[PDB]
Write a protein that binds this ligand. Structure first.
Ligand SMILES: CC(C)=CCC/C(C)=C/CC/C(C)=C/CC/C(C)=C\CSC[C@H](NC(=O)CC[C@H](N)C(=O)O)C(=O)NCC(=O)O
Lengths: 297, 194, 299
């Protein structure tokens, strides 16, 4: 069965308080806000530009991440015991991770789309075409739902007879894959494609975009270049503070389990609720912050 | 069919300097380096530009909306009809359809200006304080400010100005950069970033 | 009250549409835009039966000949170019290049395969013979630019409207003004004969549509409402004469009962300014064009 360190983690008092509280605050803010964001962003604005259709994907992604949080709140209020079906354990751990990466991949597309619309106003007009925004959204799901595929197929529940519970992704099996080497191949491929490429590309795109607006020397419209630098700087800081702590702690856990047997899962679980603050931040940081949206509000 | 992916890339410029300006030599230099109304297609740095030489008139000239920039040429040296060129400019720059198009000025003939400034007073033609009449920098900033200050209640759109000799190649790079800057400040609104 | 619905949408123009004209076959239409293509469409099937690249992009009017053998257009080029649809080789080509106006061409309409009548920003209108290629009769008397013209159903006379706010009637064979009318507070943008050939409607920047009768010699009716703070861009009757249709700056077309003066309906299928409207010779369908770059067909 599970190791002691796992049995200790599944009785931890900090996880049993922190995730239910933070999730409940995140779900209560981000469900109505992503549902008013869309109403306006989608039915009140129209998908006429590459920027609005990436923001429709983002708010749709977050809303679906926010709507599985009530299963997680219940599973952490009950002490790591899953009461629902085996099928619904598969559906919840997929709707959780497929969406939370979808947000990172979508925010990467809006960063490339602004690095383009600011740095190459004329030259990138070929790449500034709604059809290609739709293609990048479809490609995001297609990349996700292939890389995360195994979680849809295998039973993710686990009977833990020491504590008298059935866990839900909270423990896994070593037969899921043929060898330890195949766990390392699977997990570092999903890490590089779903986090580390999207992260480095997003940070670079904003840094070059902020520096371009600060170094610009025209006299007219300095009052509106600053508005742009403030909006960009807040978006960069919200992306880095939500996703970087969680995914670099995940890398250190995956490495520690594979090659040293040890664990940092409890730290990961605690940073995971910091990564869920995004669903609240997204609507304020992208939609509500801009005059074009504010004018229709 | 595939014409949509060309018309989507296109920039439109309206060229409307007066008949005594360098316009005919400018269009000839542009055409070799790259009846009435004329319409010139060329490409700068792989962006297609369309430049319209309008006939030099009530609101059917509103078909000149979607112009990104208006290019105005003035012969800076001809002080006796500078006031006519400035009134012509005042009827363009204050029209409602041109509220969201940027303005580019070329002050042409500045190789004649640097001679005439040594020969005749500019203040003899105008009411405003002109400084000492024999200095280049003072006639330049005087003429630039006299055209610039002829705008009425200008916001959102920039106005740009440059000095132009007997004709040279770099004019296409100047209007490319002013168009690029006009489209950067438009893009900030489209990106929900303004 | 009539609640018209979009029965077809036509995609192929790239910039704001500026004119369209149905054929006498009541099934094809020509259409024109600021991207400088005519497109000939089949309104039963959405087929682009022809596309014709124009010699100048600034097209402000286009027309279809009474036989369907030819089409025409003009604008800021001060010219009325004619194209032949029925060449033996099969490709469409220029039949004539009618030139001689001082101002931009604001409207043109065929009389048959051999004669065409026209209006200009220079205050004048003119009749042309397409085989000889010059003005056969010039019409003069407006104080400002002529915006639109309409033939009578028999082509014996035409009417035109101008920036002097006064509609005027011209005899095609005499070459002089027959009657002059007044009532608008601002420029007439659009004009249309009534189906009987004894009356015509008008539209203006004054936001009113108005009806005139050639035996009454005065306005018979005005169609208006208090909230219309904007101009009319285009006008025509339905074939029965009982419904009058018009397009307005605020993205919509309105329908009026020509005898009761009620706002009998509204068409609102566009999300940029309406520029043209027109009705089939069988009266079965209506077409509309706008700054969206899409035409819409209505019933
Ligand atoms: C990577 C990415 C970009 C997204 C999402 C995927 C993801 C976060 C996966 C989880 C992280 C890891 C390292 C999971 C699996 C651990 C590995 C490598 C192998 C299985 S460990 C087996 C399991 N122990 C566990 O303790 C379960 C895993 C649990 N998530 C944890 O690490 O405590 C057990 O049952 N032990 C007893 C036995 O079978 O003898």
């Amino acid at each position: 069965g599970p190791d002691n360190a796992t049995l200790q983690m599944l009785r931890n008092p900090a996880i049993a308080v922190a995730l239910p509280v933070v999730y409940s605050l995140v779900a209560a803010v981000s469900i109505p806000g992503n549902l008013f964001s869309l109403w306006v962003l989608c039915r009140r604005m129209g998908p006429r530009s590459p920027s609005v259709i990436f923001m429709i994907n983002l708010s749709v992604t977050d809303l679906m991440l926010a709507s599985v949080l009530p299963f997680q709140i219940y599973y952490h209020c009950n002490r790591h015991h899953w009461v629902f079906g085996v099928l619904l354990c598969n559906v919840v751990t997929v709707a959780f991770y497929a969406n939370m990466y979808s947000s990172i991949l979508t925010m990467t597309c809006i960063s490339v789309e602004r690095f383009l619309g600011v740095l190459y106003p004329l030259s990138s007009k070929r790449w500034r075409r709604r059809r290609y925004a739709v293609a990048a959204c479809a490609g995001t799901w297609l990349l996700l739902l292939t890389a995360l595929s195994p979680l849809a197929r295998t039973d993710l529940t686990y009977p833990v007879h020491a504590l008298g519970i059935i866990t839900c992704f909270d423990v896994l099996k070593w037969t899921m894959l043929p060898s330890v080497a195949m766990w390392a191949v699977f997990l570092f491929t999903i890490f590089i494609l779903l986090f580390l490429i999207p992260f480095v590309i997003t940070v670079a795109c904003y840094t070059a975009t902020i520096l371009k607006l600060l170094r610009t020397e025209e006299a007219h419209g300095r009052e509106q270049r600053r508005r742009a630098v403030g909006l960009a700087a807040v978006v960069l800081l919200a992306f880095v503070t939500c996703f970087a702590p969680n995914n670099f702690v995940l890398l250190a856990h995956i490495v520690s389990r594979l090659f040293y047997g040890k664990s940092y899962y409890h730290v990961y679980k605690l940073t995971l609720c910091l990564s869920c603050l995004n669903n609240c931040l997204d609507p304020f940081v992208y939609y509500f912050a801009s005059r074009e949206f504010q004018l229709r509000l | 069919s595939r014409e949509k992916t060309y018309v989507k890339r296109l920039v439109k410029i309206l060229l409307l300097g007066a008949d005594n300006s360098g316009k005919s030599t400018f269009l000839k230099q542009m055409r070799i380096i790259h009846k009435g109304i004329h319409e010139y297609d060329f490409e700068i740095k792989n962006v297609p530009f369309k430049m319209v030489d309008v006939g030099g008139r009530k609101r059917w000239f509103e078909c000149f909306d979607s112009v990104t920039s208006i290019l105005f040429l003035v012969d800076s040296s001809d002080f006796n009809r500078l006031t006519e060129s400035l009134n012509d400019f005042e009827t363009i720059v204050n029209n409602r359809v041109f509220s969201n198009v940027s303005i580019i000025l070329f002050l042409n003939k500045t190789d004649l200006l640097e001679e005439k400034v040594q020969i005749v007073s500019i203040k003899d033609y105008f009411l405003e304080f002109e400084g000492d009449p024999h200095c280049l920098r003072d006639v330049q900033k005087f003429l630039v400010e006299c055209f610039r200050n002829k705008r009425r209640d200008q916001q959102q759109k920039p106005l740009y100005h440059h000095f132009t000799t007997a004709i040279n190649t770099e004019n296409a790079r100047l209007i490319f950069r002013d168009v690029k800057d006009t489209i950067l400040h438009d893009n900030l609104k489209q990106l929900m970033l303004q | 009250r009539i609640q018209m619905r979009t029965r077809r949408t036509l995609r192929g123009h790239l910039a704001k549409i500026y004119a369209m004209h149905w054929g006498t076959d009541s099934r094809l239409l020509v259409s024109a835009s600021q991207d400088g293509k005519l497109i000939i469409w089949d309104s039963y099937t959405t087929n682009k039966v022809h596309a014709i690249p124009l010699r100048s992009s600034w097209v402000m009017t286009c027309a279809y000949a009474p036989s369907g053998n030819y089409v025409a257009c003009g604008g800021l080029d001060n010219i009325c170019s004619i194209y032949n649809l029925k060449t033996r080789e099969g490709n469409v080509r220029v039949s004539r290049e009618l030139a001689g106006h001082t101002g931009y061409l604001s409207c043109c309409r065929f009389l048959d395969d051999n004669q065409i009548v026209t209006s200009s920003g220079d205050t004048t209108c003119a009749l042309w013979d397409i085989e000889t290629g010059q003005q056969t009769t010039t019409f003069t008397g407006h104080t400002g630019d002529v915006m639109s013209l309409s033939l009578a159903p028999d082509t014996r006379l035409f009417v035109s409207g101008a920036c002097d706010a006064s509609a005027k009637l011209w005899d095609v064979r005499e070459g002089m003004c027959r009657q002059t009318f007044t009532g608008h507070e601002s420029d007439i943008n659009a004009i249309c004969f009534f189906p009987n050939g004894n009356a015509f409607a008008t539209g203006s920047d004054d936001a009113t549509c108005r009806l005139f009768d050639l035996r009454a010699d005065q306005e018979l009716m005005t169609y208006s409402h208090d909230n219309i703070i904007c101009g009319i861009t285009s006008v025509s009757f339905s074939k029965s004469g009982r419904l009058l249709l018009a397009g307005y700056d605020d993205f919509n077309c309105n329908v009026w009962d020509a005898l009761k003066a009620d706002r009998a309906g509204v068409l609102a299928g566009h999300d940029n300014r309406v520029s043209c409207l027109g009705v089939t010779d069988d009266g079965m369908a209506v077409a509309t064009g706008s700054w969206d770059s899409f035409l819409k067909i209505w019933n």
